[PDB]
Amino acid sequence: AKYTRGTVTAFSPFDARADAEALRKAMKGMGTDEETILKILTSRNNAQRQEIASAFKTLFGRDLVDDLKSELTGKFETLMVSLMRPARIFDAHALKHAIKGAGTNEKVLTEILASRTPAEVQNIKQVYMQEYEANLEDKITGETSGHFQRLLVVLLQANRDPDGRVDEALVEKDAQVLFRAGELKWGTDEETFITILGTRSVSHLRRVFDKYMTISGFQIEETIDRETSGDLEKLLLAVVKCIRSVPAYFAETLYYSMKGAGTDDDTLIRVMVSRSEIDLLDIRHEFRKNFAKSLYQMIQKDTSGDYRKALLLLCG
């Protein structure tokens, strides 16, 4: 029932052709006017960016994204190109690159499958097939293994129980099962808790989590936590956090993408872009309350140049 707000809204008055002309002017000739590019791309929403891309190609017979890639470099390029990616294909594309090539980007698989709604997951699967002529499930199963793979496959079904009647007996039963699983460090008969966390309704699991706290004295996350956690544990954590609050999950994700030396820029960019028109405002709020600091301040200290300027404009 929760209603969320993003930080990027449709620009007005909108003129796709004028914006396309401005972007071309900013790139034509040696060098680049990065300032104009970031000001336009961060202030026009995703749908508007697609209209600008179409106008750009009609006026010049050039591809806006290809030109941005040739003109820009580093993190700034990645951010601008990610902003340009159609909202409808963003996740399919992210998942494709998370599984393509050597190794697997478990973080991306986990982040997306744990936080997307059933409707969003259904779109992802259809788009993946349409765009890449491949079955997403088969691709994921081929690049992942074990319990981690199975929980991902469960989430991929986008078939979690719908919110409905409260089942007190089941809440207690599930809480008892998870308590015992937690005491066993989530390494015994994993199938049982994968069914519970992957398929029970969001409303039911929130009740189960509260009961779990009463039984153990700890919140379920506290028993699954720790750096020395495996892929399954990280997915369990993401699922639990998203069941509670997707915005809080992303606030924490942003926090850890910047806490400590260096930056997980791929994650910072991915989250800022993907959530910009959904719940980034709520994310900002959760960030400030849960970390005693503003997202704006953390970004300002961790980034620089046009990349930073664009990120801050997105943050709003």
In the complex, the residues that contact Ca ion under the rule CB under 5 A are 27, 99, 104, 143, 258, 302
Least separation in angstroms between residue 260's CB and Ca ion is 6
CA 276 to chain centre: 10
Cα(76)–Cα(137) distance, rounded to whole angstroms? 32
Which residue number, 81 or 246, has a Cβ lying nearer to Ca ion? 81
Least separation in angstroms between residue 72's CB and Ca ion is 10
Least separation in angstroms between residue 267's CB and Ca ion is 12
Which residue number, 52 or 246, has a Cβ lying nearer to Ca ion? 52
Which residue number, 143 or 277, has a Cβ lying nearer to Ca ion? 143
Which residue number, 143 or 266, has a Cβ lying nearer to Ca ion? 143
Cα(217)–Cα(236) distance, rounded to whole angstroms? 19
Cα(132)–Cα(96) distance, rounded to whole angstroms? 8
Least separation in angstroms between residue 34's CB and Ca ion is 11
Least separation in angstroms between residue 16's CB and Ca ion is 22
Which residue number, 149 or 201, has a Cβ lying nearer to Ca ion? 149
Residue showing the smallest CB distance to Ca ion in the complex:
143
Kindly tell me the sign of the dihedral angle through the C-alpha atoms of 240, 246, 247, 252: positive
- Which residues, in sequence order, are CB contacts of 259 under 8 Å at separation 6+? none
Which residue number, 117 or 267, has a Cβ lying nearer to Ca ion? 267
Least separation in angstroms between residue 31's CB and Ca ion is 6
Least separation in angstroms between residue 17's CB and Ca ion is 21
Least separation in angstroms between residue 144's CB and Ca ion is 9
Which residue number, 5 or 288, has a Cβ lying nearer to Ca ion? 288
Which residue number, 27 or 83, has a Cβ lying nearer to Ca ion? 27
